[PDB]
Amino acid sequence: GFKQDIATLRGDLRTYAQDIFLAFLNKYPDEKRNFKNYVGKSDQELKSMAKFGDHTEKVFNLMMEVADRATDCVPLASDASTLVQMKQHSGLTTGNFEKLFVALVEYMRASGQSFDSQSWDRFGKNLVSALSSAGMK
Amino acid sequence: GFKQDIATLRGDLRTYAQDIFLAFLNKYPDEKRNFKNYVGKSDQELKSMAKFGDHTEKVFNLMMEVADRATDCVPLASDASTLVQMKQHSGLTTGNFEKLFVALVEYMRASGQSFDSQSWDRFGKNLVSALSSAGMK
Ligand code: HEM
Ligand code: HEM
Question: Quick one: which residues bind heme b 7 (chains A, B) (predicted)?
Answer without folding.
Answer: 55, 58, 88-89
